[PDB]
Amino acid sequence: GMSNKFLGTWKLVSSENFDDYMKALGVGLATQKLGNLAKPTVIISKKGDIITIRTESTFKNTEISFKLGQEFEETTADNRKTKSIVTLQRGSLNQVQRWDGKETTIKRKLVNGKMVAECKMKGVVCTRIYEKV
Ligand SMILES: CCCCCCCCCCCCCCCC(=O)O
């Protein structure tokens, strides 16, 4: 099961290739500029076997509740109606969003008490590091 070291509140402290990740999904040019400046706070809670990942920003807010391996509907920060699944692999929390015959993965790993986020999309690789607060 998901390591409870994921639980807590994480604050973004480093972003790489996110600008290109955003652009690579079709994110509106207005929603783009505001995402390159956002430093969201991420809160991972649990309530039995349901995992909730909240994304709190000044700009926007998002939130997803799910069970591992079970497909759910997600509406993304940039308004994408996706059909996502979250799986566990070697301790990494891999989320995959599918829509319009497209697909992207968000692997959330832990590295030295800090959470790393690998976002893939058509050869684009974003990397965001998160510090527990
Ligand atoms: C997460 C900032 C929201 C504002 C920017 C909107 C366009 C981004 C769309 C996809 C969400 C980004 C996923 C990376 C977040 C993470 O690593 O926790």
Curated annotation (Swiss-Prot):
PROSITE patterns the record matches: FABP
Name of a matching Pfam family: Lipocalin
Keywords, sorted A to Z: Acetylation, Charcot-Marie-Tooth disease, Cytoplasm, Disease variant, Disulfide bond, Lipid-binding, Neurodegeneration, Neuropathy, Transport
Binding site for (9Z)-octadecenoate: R108, R128, I129, Y130
GO MF annotation, one: cholesterol binding
Major site of localization recorded for this protein: cytoplasm
Additional comment: P2 protein and myelin basic protein together constitute a major fraction of peripheral nervous system myelin protein.
Function: May play a role in lipid transport protein in Schwann cells. May bind cholesterol.
The protein's name in its UniProt record: Myelin P2 protein
